Amino acid sequence: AKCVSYGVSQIKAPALHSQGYTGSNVKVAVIDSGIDSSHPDLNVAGGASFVPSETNPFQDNNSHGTHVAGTVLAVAPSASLYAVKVLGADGSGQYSWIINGIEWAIANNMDVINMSLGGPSGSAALKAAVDKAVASGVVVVAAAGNSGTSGSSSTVSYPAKYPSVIAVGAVDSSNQRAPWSSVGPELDVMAPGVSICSTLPGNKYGAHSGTCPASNHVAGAAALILSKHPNWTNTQVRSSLENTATKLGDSFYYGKGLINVEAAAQH
């Protein structure tokens, strides 16, 4: 009935909020199912739809992208979020649609791309677009995936699996890896992703679990770091997050560990 996720204080975002840094001026493309801009606790700054049968990026039929927007804004309240819709009612999107989203983010000078989406395969064209975004200076963050462990295999999804992307896995309030959080050498950092409370369509709130909400926290944290260091490059934003993370378990399962946006914004 109007929650804030425990994850905001777990990544130490409050420490930036009290310095007066809240993501002001940072363009964040939420590449997802869209965002219910009808929600009174959300500011959407604009958007576009690359789903051919669904022209409206501000209608969230699946309720995923609205949750994403909320979690990004809980970390970075004055961030400018753009609803970039590449996922249909079925919850999946063609590579051509997702690539259209990424090309859009580059053309409209997004500072941060959040991709709370995955699949088990890549494409040369997908990797090309993600790399091109990071070359042009965009911080690209993506959910590591919800495939759990599978012996010695990487279970990290594309595009999080690409080295040009910040792959984000999910811990709970105890910094324990969620059993469904994907794993592998491509896993970069962890953030809260268990029962994360946020905005849902129709002026509602509720908890989602997944690496999607984990990655939402990191995209938020990037917007908080660029609030404070507006002249930092994506390389510097990414190093700050990785080099100041709180170490947890092995890097196969946890990567660098829990992000600490407080320590990151001092680096």
Author numbering: 1 to 75, 85 to 276
Article excerpt on this structure:
Omniligase-1 is a broadly applicable enzyme for peptide bond formation between an activated acyl donor peptide and a non-protected acyl acceptor peptide. The enzyme is derived from an earlier subtilisin variant called peptiligase by several rounds of protein engineering aimed at increasing synthetic yields and substrate range. Mutation A225N in the S1′ pocket and F189W of the S2′ pocket increased the synthesis to hydrolysis (S/H) ratio and overall coupling efficiency, whereas the I107V mutation was added to S4 pocket to increase the reaction rate. The final omniligase variants appeared to have a very broad substrate range, coupling more than 250 peptides in a 400-member library of acyl acceptors, as indicated by a high-throughput FRET assay.
Thus, Oml-1 and other omniligase variants containing mutation F189W, which is crucial for the broad substrate scope, cannot be crystallized in crystal form A or B. Crystals of variants containing a Trp at position 189 were only found after a long incubation time for Pre-4 (Ptl-M222P/L217H/A225N/F189W) and Pre-5 (Ptl-M222P/L217H/A225N/F189W/N218D). The structures of Pre-4 and Pre-5 each contain three protein molecules in the asymmetric unit (molecules A-C). In both of these variants Trp189 is involved in intermolecular contacts which are different from those in Pre-1-Pre-3. In addition to the role of Phe189 in crystal formation, we observed that for both Pre-4 and Pre-5, crystallization resulted in at least one substrate binding site occupied by a peptide sequence. Variants Pre-4 and Pre-5 crystallized in crystal form C containing three protein molecules (A, B and C) in the asymmetric unit. In crystal form C the structure of molecule C is more different with RMSDs of 0.6 – 0.7 Å to molecules A and B. It has an oxidized cysteine and a bound eglin fragment (41′-46′ (SPVTLAG P5 -P1′)) that was used as a crystallization aid. In this crystal form C, we also observed a crystallization artifact; part of the loop from Ile205 to His217 of molecule C is forcibly drawn into the active site of molecule B, mimicking a peptide substrate. Hence, the conformation of the five N-terminal residues of chain C (AKCVG) also changed. This is an example of a crystallization artifact, and shows that ligases have a strong preference for binding a peptide in the active site even if it is their sibling. The second effect is due to F189W in the S2′ pocket, which serves as a strong binding force to drive the binding of substrates with hydrophobic residues at P2′.
